[PDB]
Amino acid sequence: GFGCNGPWNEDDLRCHNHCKSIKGYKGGYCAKGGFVCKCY
């Protein structure tokens, strides 16, 4: 989710922005073929 909807729809920037918008995270990326929006 959050941009990462699979390799056919991978909005890594959208995941990144989401995660970065959350206090406690610097950013985020689409993992697992682009399915899982993982924050860091």
UniProtKB/Swiss-Prot annotation:
Disulfide bonds join 4-30, 15-37, 19-39. It is found in: Secreted; Host cell membrane. It comes from the Eukaryota. Beta-D-GlcNAc-(1->4)-Mur2Ac(oyl-L-Ala-gamma-D-Glu-L-Lys-D-Ala-D-Ala)-di-trans,octa-cis-undecaprenyl diphosphate binds at residues 2-4, 12, 18, 29, 31, 33, 37-38. Residues 6-9, 31-37 are annotated as: Binds to membrane interface. Changing residue 12 to A/C/E/F/G/H/I/K/L/M/N/P/Q/R/S/T/V/W/Y: Complete loss of antibacterial activity. In mice infected by S.pneumoniae, it has an efficacy comparable to vancomycin in the peritoneal model and to penicillin in the pneumonia model. Antimicrobial peptide that potently acts against several species of Gram-positive bacteria. It selectively inhibits peptidoglycan biosynthesis through complex formation with the cell wall precursor lipid II (1:1 molar ratio) thus inhibiting cell wall synthesis. It does not disrupt cell membranes. Is especially active against numerous clinical isolates of S.pneumoniae, including all 90 different serotypes and isolates resistant to clinically used antibiotics. In vitro, shows considerable selectivity for bacteria over mammalian cells. Belongs to the invertebrate defensin family. Type 2 subfamily. This is Fungal defensin plectasin. The lineage of its organism: Eukaryota, Fungi, Dikarya, Ascomycota, Pezizomycotina. The chain holds residues 56 to 95 of 95 of the full protein.
